[PDB]
Amino acid sequence: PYAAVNGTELHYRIDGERHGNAPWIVLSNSLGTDLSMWAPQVAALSKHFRVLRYDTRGHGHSEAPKGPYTIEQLTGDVLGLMDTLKIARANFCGLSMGGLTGVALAARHADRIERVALCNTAARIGSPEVWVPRAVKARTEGMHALADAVLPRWFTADYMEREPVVLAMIRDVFVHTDKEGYASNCEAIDAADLRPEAPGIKVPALVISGTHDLAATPAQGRELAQAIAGARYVELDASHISNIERADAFTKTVVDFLTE
Amino acid sequence: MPYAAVNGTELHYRIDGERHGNAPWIVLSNSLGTDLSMWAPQVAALSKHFRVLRYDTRGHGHSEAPKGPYTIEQLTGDVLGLMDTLKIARANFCGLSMGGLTGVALAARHADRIERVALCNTAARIGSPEVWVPRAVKARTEGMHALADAVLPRWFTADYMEREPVVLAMIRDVFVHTDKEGYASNCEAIDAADLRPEAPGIKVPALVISGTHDLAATPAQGRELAQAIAGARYVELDASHISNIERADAFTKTVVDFLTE
Numbered sequence: 125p126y127a128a129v130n131g132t133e134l135h136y137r138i139d140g141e142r143h144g145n146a147p148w149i150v151l152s153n154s155l156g157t158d159l160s161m162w163a164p165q166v167a168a169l170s171k172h173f174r175v176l177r178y179d180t181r182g183h184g185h186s187e188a189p190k191g192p193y194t195i196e197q198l199t200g201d202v203l204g205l206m207d208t209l210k211i212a213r214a215n216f217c218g219l220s221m222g223g224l225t226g227v228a229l230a231a232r233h234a235d236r237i238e239r240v241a242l243c244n245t246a247a248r249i250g251s252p253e254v255w256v257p258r259a260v261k262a263r264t265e266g267m268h269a270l271a272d273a274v275l276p277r278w279f280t281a282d283y284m285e286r287e288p289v290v291l292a293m294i295r296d297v298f299v300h301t302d303k304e305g306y307a308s309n310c311e312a313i314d315a316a317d318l319r320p321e322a323p324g325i326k327v328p329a330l331v332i333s334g335t336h337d338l339a340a341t342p343a344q345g346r347e348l349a350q351a352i353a354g355a356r357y358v359e360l361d362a363s364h365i366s367n368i369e370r371a372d373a374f375t376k377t378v379v380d381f382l383t384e
Numbered sequence: 385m386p387y388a389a390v391n392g393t394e395l396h397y398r399i400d401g402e403r404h405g406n407a408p409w410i411v412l413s414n415s416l417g418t419d420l421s422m423w424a425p426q427v428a429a430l431s432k433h434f435r436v437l438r439y440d441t442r443g444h445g446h447s448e449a450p451k452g453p454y455t456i457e458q459l460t461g462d463v464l465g466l467m468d469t470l471k472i473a474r475a476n477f478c479g480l481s482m483g484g485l486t487g488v489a490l491a492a493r494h495a496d497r498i499e500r501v502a503l504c505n506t507a508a509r510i511g512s513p514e515v516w517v518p519r520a521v522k523a524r525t526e527g528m529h530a531l532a533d534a535v536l537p538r539w540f541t542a543d544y545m546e547r548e549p550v551v552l553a554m555i556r557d558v559f560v561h562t563d564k565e566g567y568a569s570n571c572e573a574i575d576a577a578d579l580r581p582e583a584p585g586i587k588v589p590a591l592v593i594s595g596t597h598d599l600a601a602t603p604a605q606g607r608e609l610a611q612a613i614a615g616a617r618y619v620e621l622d623a624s625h626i627s628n629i630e631r632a633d634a635f636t637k638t639v640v641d642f643l644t645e
C-alpha cells in the first residue's frame with residue numbers, strides 16, 4: 125500500500141477495525157527507522173483505534189524526493205495521507221522527528237488532530253554540530269558507516285547486549301535507509317525550530333522523554349511540556365527509542381492518555 | 385527500494401557486504417509468512433565472509449503476489465532469475481523451512497549454480513495436505529490475523545515468546561500483513577512439493593539444521609534429509625521452528641563455520 129501525496133509516494137500500513145468505527149491514531153517514525161519501529165504498540169493501539177503507520181519521505185519503502193526537506197513538507201505529507209484516506213481528524217503519536225512533526229501539526233492544524241503524544245523529541249532537535257556532519261557522512265560514506273555511531277544513542281548498552289535480534293532488525297532498517305533521503309531529513313530537522321509555536325498547541329498533549337536519551341533530552345521534553353498548556357510530561361527509563369526498550373510502559377502511557 | 389522483474393514477477397531484494405567485492409555470494413531464503421527482516425541476526429556475521437543476498441519470496445513482504453497457486457518451480461526460478469539479474473554465477477544458499485525446501489530443489493536441479501547449502505528447519509516434504517489445505521482456506525477466507533494465533537506459537541518455544549515480546553510483535557507484524565492470497569498460494573506450493581526422491585541426487589556439501597522443538601519440520605525429518613544427501617551433516621539446535629532467531633548466536637556460528645570450512 126502506497127499513496128501519492130504531494131507528488132511523493134508514501135508507503136503506509138493500516139491496522140485495526142477497518143469496517144469499524146474507532147478513532148484514528150497516526151504514528152510518525154524517528155529518523156533512520158521505518159514503520160516496523162511501531163510493531164510493539166500495534167496490538168494495544170488496535171484495541172482502541174484504527175492505526176495508520178507510514179514511512180516518512182526518504183525512508184523505508186517510501187519515495188526519496190529531492191531535498192533538502194522541510195518541516196512543512198513533513199507536515200504536509202501527513203495531512204495529504206489523511207486526505208487520501210479520508211481521515212478527517214486523528215490522534216497523533218510521533219517519535220523524535222515524528223514528535224517534531226506532531227508539534228507542527230498540533231500548533232498549526234488542530235482541526236485535524238485530536239490528541240498529540242510527543243515522544244523522545246524536542247521543539248528544536250539537536251544543532252548544526254549534529255546535523256551538518258551527519259548529512260555529509262550519510263552522503264559521502266553511506267549509512268553503514270553511520271550506524272556504529274548512531275545506534276548506541278538509541279538504546280542503552282545493556283538493552284543492546286540483551287537484545288541482539290531487536291538491535292539487528294533495527295540496525296538493518298537504518299543501514300538500508302536511502303542515504304540522500306536520510307541526509308535531506310537531517311536538513312529538515314536542523315532547519316526546524318518550533319519553539320516559537322509550541323505554546324500555541326491547544327489540544328491535549330503528552331510528552332514522553334527517556335532518562336538516558338542524549339539525542340533529545342529530559343530537559344528538552346520538560347521545556348516542550350511546560351510550553352504547552354495542560355501538557356503532561358512522562359519520563360521513561362529508556363534512551364532514545366523508548367517505545368522499544370520500554371515497550372510496555374510506553375504503550376500503557378500512550379493508550380491511557382489517548383483513551384482519556 | 386531494490387526490485388527485480390524476474391520469472392514473470394517482481395521481487396524485493398537486499399544486498400549486504402561489498403557488492404562489487406570478490407567474496408563468495410550467499411543467498412538466504414525465507415520461511416512462509418516472513419520477509420527478509422527475519423535474517424537480520426545473521427547479516428553482520430555473514431557480511432564478513434560473503435556478499436549477502438536476501439529477498440522477499442513471491443507473495444511476501446514487498447514483493448509482488450502474482451496469481452497462484454505457486455509451484456516449487458516458480459520458487460526455484462525466482463532465485464535463479466534474481467541471481468541472473470545480479471550477474472551472480474554461483475552462491476552458497478541458506479534457506480529456512482520453505483526456504484530450505486527451495487534449497488533442496490536448487491541443490492538437486494541446479495548444482496552448478498550452488499556452492500554449499502544450509503537447509504534449516506526444513507524437510508524434503510514439509511507437512512501434509514491435512515495441514516496445508518485448511519491453512520490456505522483459512523488464510524483466503526478469514527485473513528491473516530486468525531492464522532497468526534495458530535501459526536506463531538509453532539515458531540518459538542513458549543518461554544522465548546514470553547521473554548521476547550518485541551521480537552514477537554515485529555515478526556507478527558510481518559506475518560499479519562502478508563498478502564493472504566500470496567500466503568495461501570505458497571501453502572499450495574509447499575504441499576505439492578515432495579522433493580524426497582530428488583534429495584539423494586544432491587552433489588554439493590550440505591548442512592541440515594533442525595530445532596528439537598520444531599513440530600512444523602521435525603528433527604526426524606532433518607535426519608532423513610541429512611541421510612539422503614552424500615556427505616551432508618546434521619546439527620540440532622535447542623529451538624523450535626524459527627531457530628535462526630530463537631538461537632541466533634548458535635545458528636549463525638553453525639552456518640558460518642560450515643560455509644567457510
Ligand SMILES: CC(=O)CCC(=O)O
Pocket residue numbers: 415416417481511515535538600
Ligand atoms: C511459516 C508458516 O506460516 C507455516 C509453518 C507451519 O507449518 O507451522
